[PDB]
Amino acid sequence: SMQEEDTFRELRIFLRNVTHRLAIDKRFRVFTKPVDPDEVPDYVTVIKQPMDLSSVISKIDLHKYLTVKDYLRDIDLICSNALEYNPDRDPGDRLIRHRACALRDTAYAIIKEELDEDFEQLCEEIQESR
């Protein structure tokens, strides 16, 4: 219905705003664009589902997220990919990991404070009916 489409449009607005706030944080610059295969040809041999904040915005605009839980699976993916691709104890890798975990924690905290649980439940129920 038109009312369900209004719901999903509100979800997209909410998700763009959360993603913008993550994308402008200096700590998360390394997650703002895809890892460049021209610069890191090894990356795809390890990471099978690349994800980044630009790709998240593209997915929002493509109507790929019908719930915040589905959005969070992709934030979880940006984080898990960084932990998997950069696991060693050297400081450069520790720093990327810390930042990946901060990105995840920040997204979850913003959502905890700003997502109405009944709004999410409504989204989930509409998605389940399709």
Partner: peptide
């Protein structure tokens, strides 16, 4: 694997 350093 790894970008750091």
């Amino acid at each position: 694997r790894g970008k750091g350093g």
